[model samples]
Target: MKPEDVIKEQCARAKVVAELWHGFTGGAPKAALENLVVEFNKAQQGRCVRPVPQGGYRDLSTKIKAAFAAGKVPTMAQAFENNIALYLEAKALLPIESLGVKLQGVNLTFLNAVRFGGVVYGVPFNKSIQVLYYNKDLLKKHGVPVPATLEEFVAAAKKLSRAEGGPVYWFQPDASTFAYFFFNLGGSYLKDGKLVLNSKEAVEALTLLQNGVKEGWAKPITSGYINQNLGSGPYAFSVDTSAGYTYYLRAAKFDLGVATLPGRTKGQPGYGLVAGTNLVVFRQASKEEQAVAKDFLEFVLSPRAQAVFATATGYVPVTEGALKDPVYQAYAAENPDYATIVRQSRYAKFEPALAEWEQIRFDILGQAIKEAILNKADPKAALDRAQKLAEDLLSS
Candidate 1:
């Protein structure tokens, strides 16, 4: 049937579908969220939601800020926990459970993703874990299977690069990737009401990346995604997000390999930060629209739906039941790359639930990365600089 015919059929069956009484605005689901919206609308008669695009995350955040200021907001929206923090201060959000939503069976890691200081503000809808993505051919050329730990990772990077390295590992200079390394290496950014950006492990983490680049074994890609040039060159492996698998598959022409990010040591399980947005309901929405939105959320967070979402998109399933469901399991078993994501998701960590952690905005940490790696600054001094700013933020 044509698109209009399908819409006509939907409208005939459910008046709510025709009304578009509730809407969801998000930067990305990186999957067919529109089709899922249709499924939710079809599955729950008298319930409907239309996906509203207001550009990407930054744009979406700006629009949401404007809407909140103007006393108008979408019935439901995708927001990072930090965004919720800002709204929470303004009393702009309704705790999702207040709308009669249940919080059973959510993975603790994912549940923490939506919670702020022990209060839930949203439902975990989409989430991604960091996984090591590698150029299989490059690993083969370097005579390494895949790095098993950070030690082996540096070894592989060195072997994979030339005497004059050229973006060998496609290093990402952002704060997120830095946290990935720091966390897995046993660094915690916050401890006992003090910020520790220059912890022992943090220094080690920065040193590893800085030295790799300094010694001609790695290079940082500052802007745009690291995946854009992944297929064309000297990159052997990248410790990046699992949700980007589809993009790699579409863009690369060679053997692609996915693995859990290297652990702090061999024989240890890998660790990663859970990254992605969650679905939130707004207090500004009408009670009727919020009810419709809740029904839609329930259906979307169902086990089968979660399985389907993970399989269709590269993001991992957020609930234990969904991860165990046959829909996702079969896909994982058949696809090794996705299987690696599942394994990694089992142990991934969520961002700390601190209001101040969100406010720092990583400006201090980001510049530290640039100085240490690109400008050949001392990792300790660079991290010390970061610690100064982060310390001031924490103290205030």
Candidate 2:
């Protein structure tokens, strides 16, 4: 239907039902979200928000594109910054402000992540940052106390590597992992609309990883999830998303330690790429439906709701008050692995929100990393090649 028809049909009704297209499928997250909807629905009088889960993130992204082409969309959906960028390009989004919602207690970093050129388009609740997953048993056995700085981490990895004659660090080769290392090394991904793949710090970031593998401190595992590799460990450390806590716990046979990714200097947990999706309101929904979607978002961000979701899914609650909510405190008594990640959120940042960033990261920079680290090409030469490709691709 056209905008006028939607407005007319919606206005004639006493209630509006907004469908929330989401991808929180399987496990505790799925159950937690179902409970959230039940509670939210109970409190509602005239607005009912329905939950629609597409299989997973990839499924959701694909279906969202198909829905847009069909000119029919859910009232709201979950999206990454890159997805948001594409939606905005087609003028298909409603800014959060347009729905008359004030994001009062939501974290500023989260708000910044969901913004496009400083305008809020989404509201973040589910989020996570990079964390160092270490084998406490191995570290204790080798007497390797590390983290809060890369100097100590390098020493520990080098020591454990030769001592055990096994991989000390499971080097994660992904966009966010590269982002974590590059930013900590003082590299910027974007400067004045120009690509920073060839920046001195960027080169250092790749060189750092290259050195790790070349020097035998890191094992280059190109395929499979880090949790899979870390299932049962003789491994010392691996940097991975904090949201993987549950899976890691289920896999770990030894004592596991979740540490903040180390920074370049002493007493610092370095910056990281905050990875996750945020809730966005779509323009295809009528204003009446949009209002209901706004209410749904507010309900999701409430302290009790946030705490409930976080505890179930291992996502950090987006509000400070959510951290101390009684429900979370009770959950913490049984599962104390969340504390480090809760603190890690403070050091996390969103990667470049540009539409072409994925191409630069995966096709260009990802290949460079493979060539240098796996294929044994010079790091500088690899990055220089990717940089030229990034600049050209981003421009057109």
Candidate 3:
């Protein structure tokens, strides 16, 4: 059906109706979130939400941009930190808090993405962080306790590979995660609004991963999905988002253990990427529509919804009340493995929310990491080129 037809039909069905553009595709994430919307609509009685799934974040970003250009934006949309910055720069966002929305119990750290110039433009809809997942049986067999430091991590991976008589440790890295390792090595990605990939600390961070692959102890899982590779086999350890824990748990037959990412030094500082999407209200929406959107947003952050979402979808709860909610508390007690994500939340780091960061991360830095891992390219050369490419992008 045409978009207008759909909107008209939705209007006919409810007193107050709002369209929500989101990036959740099929599976539990999509189903669980849709269920929450259904409950909210039922609870509101006369208000309804029409959710439009836009495939993924990248696709959603493109579609939302087009919608803005055409002046047909949705009431609200799910956005990444960098994408939200673009909308903010265009003055296309409505600050939900100013709409009389009460976000009393939200995790403020999750708001780092949507807050700019001391103003919050959105709220965390779904959030997660990377965690080190290990095969418990393999670790026990190899007498390798869960690693706490970079050296111990490498040694454990080597021992697991040796025990399995193959490269059992999968060191999968993504654009979002590059910073985790960088920070773990005491490096920062941004220095005075410039790419710092060539810094000594940054090179050392890349070198650690490069050396792992070179030593044949841990191989980079480049094809398919890292979570799939992690769950399917002799692979002993893989770092992945907590939101994927359910799938990983179901896929892996062995006992899976979750822990915070290892630090460069034992029992010292460590890090993980704060990964997820936020809900942003559009400036194009009327006050009435924005008020309705605020209701939906508040419902999403409600303790009940937070508990349900976190457990059902493997995403961490975004509200402090959710952490203490009886339902979530019970679930966490019974499922300590997944609970590790909540514990690791304190160590999570946010990516830069600058508008230029989206292209810099995915196009330049991501490609450089892939080439370094898959094409046997030198880490220094690849990162040097990435730095130059990022500089060029900024200049353009």
- Tens digit of per-residue lDDT, candidate 2, span 5-99: 33334334537788878887655666667677767766767567677789877688779889988989999888888888978998989889867
Candidate 1 pairs with clashing backbones: none
Comparison by TM-score, 2 against 3, better one: 3
lDDT of 3 by residue, 119-218 (tens): 8888898898888888888888767888988778888888887777677667665576567678777788778876676787767767767777777776
Instruction: In model 3, state the lDDT of residue 325.
Output: 84
Rank the candidate models, highest lDDT first: 2, 3, 1
TM-score for candidate 3, residues paired by index: 0.93
lDDT of 1 by residue, 156-215 (tens): 777778632565787677677887788887788668867677889889888878877777
- Highest TM-score model number: 3
Worst 10 residues of 2 by lDDT: 2-11
Query: Which residue pairs overlap in candidate 2's backbone?
Result: none
Error of 2 at 16 (Å): 5.3
> What is the C-alpha local distance difference test score of each model?
0.73, 0.80, 0.79
Candidates 1 and 2, the one with greater lDDT: 2
Clashing pairs in 3: none
